[PDB]
Amino acid sequence: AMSLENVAFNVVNKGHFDGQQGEVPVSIINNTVYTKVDGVDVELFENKTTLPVNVAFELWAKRNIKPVPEVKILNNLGVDIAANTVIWDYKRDAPAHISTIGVCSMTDIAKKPTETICAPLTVFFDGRVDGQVDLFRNARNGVLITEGSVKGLQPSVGPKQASLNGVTLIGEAVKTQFNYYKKVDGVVQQLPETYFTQSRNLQEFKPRSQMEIDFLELAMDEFIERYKLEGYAFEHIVYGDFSHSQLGGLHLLIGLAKRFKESPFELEDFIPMDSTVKNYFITDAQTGSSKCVCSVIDLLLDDFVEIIKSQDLSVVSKVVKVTIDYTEISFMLWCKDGHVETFYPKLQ
Amino acid sequence: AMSLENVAFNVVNKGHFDGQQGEVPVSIINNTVYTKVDGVDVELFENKTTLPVNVAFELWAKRNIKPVPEVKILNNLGVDIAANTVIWDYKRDAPAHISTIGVCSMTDIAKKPTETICAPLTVFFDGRVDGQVDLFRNARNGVLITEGSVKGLQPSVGPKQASLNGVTLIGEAVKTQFNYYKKVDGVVQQLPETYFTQSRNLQEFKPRSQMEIDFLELAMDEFIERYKLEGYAFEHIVYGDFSHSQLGGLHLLIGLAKRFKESPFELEDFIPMDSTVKNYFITDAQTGSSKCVCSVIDLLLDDFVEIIKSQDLSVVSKVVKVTIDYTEISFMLWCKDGHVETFYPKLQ
Amino acid sequence: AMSLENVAFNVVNKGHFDGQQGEVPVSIINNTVYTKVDGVDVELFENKTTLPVNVAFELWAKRNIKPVPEVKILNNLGVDIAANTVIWDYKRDAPAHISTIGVCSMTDIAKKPTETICAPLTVFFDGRVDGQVDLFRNARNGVLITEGSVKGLQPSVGPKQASLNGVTLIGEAVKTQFNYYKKVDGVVQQLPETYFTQSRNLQEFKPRSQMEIDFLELAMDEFIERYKLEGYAFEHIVYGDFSHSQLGGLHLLIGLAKRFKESPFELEDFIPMDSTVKNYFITDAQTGSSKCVCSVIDLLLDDFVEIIKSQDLSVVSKVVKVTIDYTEISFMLWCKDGHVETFYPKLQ
Amino acid sequence: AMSLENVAFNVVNKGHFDGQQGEVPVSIINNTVYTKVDGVDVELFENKTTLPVNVAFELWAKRNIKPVPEVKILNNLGVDIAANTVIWDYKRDAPAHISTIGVCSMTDIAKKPTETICAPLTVFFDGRVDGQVDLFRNARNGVLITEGSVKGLQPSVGPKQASLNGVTLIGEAVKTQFNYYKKVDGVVQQLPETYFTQSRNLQEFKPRSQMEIDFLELAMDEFIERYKLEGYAFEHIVYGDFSHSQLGGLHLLIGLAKRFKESPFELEDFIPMDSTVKNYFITDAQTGSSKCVCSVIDLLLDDFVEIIKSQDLSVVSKVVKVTIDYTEISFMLWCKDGHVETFYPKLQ
Amino acid sequence: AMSLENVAFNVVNKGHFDGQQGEVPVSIINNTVYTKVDGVDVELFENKTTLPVNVAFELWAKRNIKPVPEVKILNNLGVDIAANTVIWDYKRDAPAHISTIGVCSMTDIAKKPTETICAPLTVFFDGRVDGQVDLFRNARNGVLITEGSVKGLQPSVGPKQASLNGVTLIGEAVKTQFNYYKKVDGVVQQLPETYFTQSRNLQEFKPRSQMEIDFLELAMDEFIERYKLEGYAFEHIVYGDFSHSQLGGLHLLIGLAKRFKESPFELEDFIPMDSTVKNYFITDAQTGSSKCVCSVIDLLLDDFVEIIKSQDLSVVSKVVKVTIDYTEISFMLWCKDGHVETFYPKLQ
């Protein structure tokens, strides 16, 4: 007995949609949902989506409140739709997927993922929900996450972190590391060997290794000395060059975090969404050095160091494909006289 | 079990809210309510009110579909709120009253009119609904309509016409003439002697008397000759003078209807609402004669002749108070040498 | 003492802005202005402009309520702004000009047209307002309209019709024929010889000559016989050809009006504005003959016969420039063997 | 002479409405008020209310800029409307009350609180404004605040803090502690003996006692040791349990503030308004422990300690009613073997 | 080949408009521009302007990404429009100017600044763009900025800081100090001798002199002692008096920054725009001292000290005009017995 008033009742009483019965009076004004709390209207939801306000309200209330894969992972895996849940994209304030399966009558393409409409779409299955491993086995296309072993299915250990209600974290009270499985045209596809982005912030960047502790504490020339990084252009790539009008390098989040403690800078996120590689229009406030498209990736410094050190430095310029977050990230390697000039996530 | 989806279900299946169970999928976009009909959205309601779109949708769906008093009558009687119904104002595309009683949880001030909040307000009671005559008897303030006699209560025979779903008509299959009763502070009132406006349209004006048939068929000087209207300025007041830049007179709907058959004109209804007297910015398309505020009243021509004939034509200018539709309508009488110069609903 | 509440007071009490003092309570919701009339909101204005709702409300309330030149005439004369008035464009539900002079503080570029900002702009002056003939004499650029003679200034007799509150009419109670004067860079211009469009409607088309009476009453081959129009393609140009999938000709409003009495058709006005030549996507409902861009001009049939009769019918195709409404209208003349094939307002 | 342009003039020149004369040109676009400052529009107000944009602009400009009671206090006291002022709810970006008394013609139910419409409503009176103590004496329903003694009226000393322009503070340059008085149906009602919430923030939480200094500085088991809090479940209730998927306890703001220094967490305020007890959907970022409805109250730790220590621990579960902010806050006490299991503001 | 889809392509691929060819599918919803990134909409721009959403999107994408003069400087110089660029006002989230020159067809008054429409307007020229010095020489009105010498043109050294993408900074990798030139009616106007505001923030205020280091570190009476500021009311003017209900003085940003470290306060920026002198409704959170209009100027403390020390203290009250940011800032000097009582940017 689905209704706007019942969704609002659940938001008010349960903090989210929890299948409870009841209704609260709602008023909809423009793109905002309100509820009368003792005579005055209290805002429950502000629609930031391209969907109708009441439709987005229900989808947001029916969002998965369990730790789920980050949208970038789901996207790199080709996920089109989720099975009997809504993955909320907190970075875009919108549902990660256009349609639903057994969630909301306005966005539903099917009630069960076994319906023919779902066969050509890569449905996301959560092995933590009863019957979803079997639904994945019978689904023509899908992505499955589990907490343990699935008999006969070869696992792909995913990232340590998951998104819980918009918070990217490595779980201690909850499991955030999942086993990943994919199916393309009824066939279980072998997921590639891959690195994972660390999903850290600039404001609260914490080192996750001794090399990262040394990078943040030590001076530039003495960190490079310790880790044998001479001839690998870390001064340009990771530390960044703020001497000319165009900002040089600065493509690893760890290098932005180090700069951040000394002096502030503006990162204009002109395509605000979750992605393995992010693009920013960066303006350094101390020097005035700036760059319209500064591609930034949050790799564990040891992982980036391993990627660059295992590259041949004999060619002037080549494309270096690295599998990060299950996707092939093309990088652009530029060399001269046996030393790296620059190495950056390739702008397409 | 009130819900947006259930109201929409009733609109879709029953043409209005009919207490039926069921839900249809709704999407709200801006000020418009839509329903999915086999994949595509179909518009159900366009909010023209100052209330939230979903709230106005429910009030409109819960409108009285029986012949009810015209909003102008209810307004002249001081009606603030209706009992367990919504009087839809089709001229304003909005509810006639701000609040409701046992209709919609967002607009309800009470569920039953017997609650203390309703005592100071003039509640509208419909004797055609079971128990409303008694509720009126125990209500401090109220206006009652009945089809027949109420024991002990002296009636006021209201207008012949009522509004059925926005159509003002004199019923043949339905009763449209009601008995009116009013109570102020527990005291049953003696409703004054009143004339009634005929609520006719310009496009479909029909004469309701022999004098009105003669006015529409006969020429100006020969109608006035027949009805001894010499010296009462009907040439100015009713027929209208289109010879000067400012349109002279034309204050009776019958005179606008007669002009309408010969040549067209524009009536700009700058305050669109139901009222005993209406104001228009009239532009005559044939001559170009115009007037910013031309007050127009639809009185039965015999009634308007009785009012003008029962006046003292000896003062230059005076205010002539006439009870029309239960309200006191001030008119402005202008005379010279014992003859009327002009007589029009007072602009104030 | 300009205010939203005062403008609304004038709209409510005077039918338009009339410099009266007073205020009424206003509420603005989306693009609509409302006023409280005894507890409920009554719509006063719906903004159809690209200006802010309160700004457009004031400009509309301050519109010229006297018969004024049609927007197409003002436009063909290069009028940029009006002096101390607002010419309301009733076809676009918007002000005819972007800025004002001494009208509204939000749109005003100057209070008086004598200010330097107005010198490069063609200010519209109305000789019917005290002091505007003199203001025109001292204005560098301007267009003047008068009812009678201006000493020393040679006049151009404008069209018979003017727009009074959105109604295009030939005045009987008011003067609608003006004398036109134009000045470019201080030099009084000699306005060219021009024809005028008749500004008629399809629903209420009235013949303004004996040739037009004969065209509407007589049959095709017998009207052409009477007026010696053999070889001038009137069967195609004026009457229209509805035998093929593409509608042939039908470029003169008189021919659309004649078709209209027999069978209906849809005219999609895809660029809704006032112009000498209008373009419509016409679909004939009887035959299904249609045309995406059917240019239509309302010329007096005698004027259109004079234009076609005074052409050289010896070249296959040429551009025929005709001055209509003071503007140069290009027509496309197509001939074969000394007879007209087609003649239509040039699509460019 | 109230107007949109005059309100805007006062906002621009006086920082708020100050009864000054003058007008500034305003443009209204969507839900935003703008003023032309040297040719370009500058935003003055963004409507976050369910009221029309110009109406909310005036109410916000006419907000009380003196230290006033917090909305939660006014709400717990049953305040419906304020007398000749607007209490701005800075937490909801909206007026605390639906209607006004002698403030704005669009929201006014009366000009003076002595009018009959105000008798059934609890009007808020400010003894700091001349004549408001007397108005309270003659008001059937009301809440009064004073800075000192009112002859014959028994006072209720309120909270130390008040809201000054959105800032909750304990005044030093201004008085923030008021005397409270209430009237229900013409009878002065004895306000209850009550505790008060401390109205602190998480970001800037400061201890207001030695017990609170000890709680924030000392370790868990050594604070409990010092204050004899063994067997009272402070480890669960105040400190919080982040070991399981559902976050245990954490119902006192002081415990959230202590957690905040060590590790961050997200508090989703799904009903954003001022209330004695607040509900949050909390997600701990370090552990991933979370709770959909975590009720949180900011009591002085000594006050909470006194509340819990004065409870009988013989029953498995009972409702414990505590008067906080003049309202009866129901708590749920759970015990086992003579020790407290949990104690939390009861979810209704 | 300008288009919405091409602007969006440039925003997506180049971080801003860069003249590149290509199109990305766009959807416009309300006041927001979106792009489909793998099936879901990603927000590219939120219109905060009074211009149409697609128009403001193009202007923002076409904003000057080089260090440009701060809007307050341009405004004090009388700049109306920029030549072949858009100066984005990041404080108002809108273009600094109403119209453009060769930027966007919807806002363009001309394609080149040499067109007659531009002659009466003060066009902004950037000597760093080829041909703009010459365009300034031929422009009737204009403001020019250069990086070096212009033959024959007497320079005015401007402020050290410029705005680069919204960031006010003193350039190290880029030049931010420009030479300024002005022309009024074809005549090069001598720019006045002036002080400059330091354009600092409260959150990140850094001293730019030894006097400013001493002010922030030293106590009140010992700073005044060192700098001989006795009898100059710095205790009131710069430090601020928080003892009475109305906040005393506090008109220099350095004094707000010093207060900020000790205790927080709210600055309501009721006219949010760039100006030499800013007005705030300040509420001190510790004391509750407040002021509706507290004018604040960010002058280098040495510059303010020099301004006040060079004033005659013989008159009770006088207007002190100081040229700051090329504009005459009127200050109000109040004296008694040879000592300063108060000195503040004069409220007009």
Ligand SMILES: NC(=O)NCc1ccco1
């Ligand atoms: N990342 C990873 O461990 N891939 C191995 C795999 C096995 C089956 C699917 O992927």
Ligand SMILES: NC(=O)NCc1ccco1
């Ligand atoms: N309020 C008032 O004056 N009412 C008049 C009345 C009371 C009873 C009958 O009429």
Ligand SMILES: NC(=O)NCc1ccco1
């Ligand atoms: N700008 C221009 O070329 N104007 C033509 C003109 C000037 C005077 C009379 O005509």
Ligand SMILES: NC(=O)NCc1ccco1
């Ligand atoms: N909180 C408190 O002090 N109550 C006592 C009281 C006296 C009159 C009304 O309340």
Ligand SMILES: NC(=O)NCc1ccco1
């Ligand atoms: N500020 C300044 O240096 N003014 C001198 C000047 C010379 C020409 C124009 O201004």
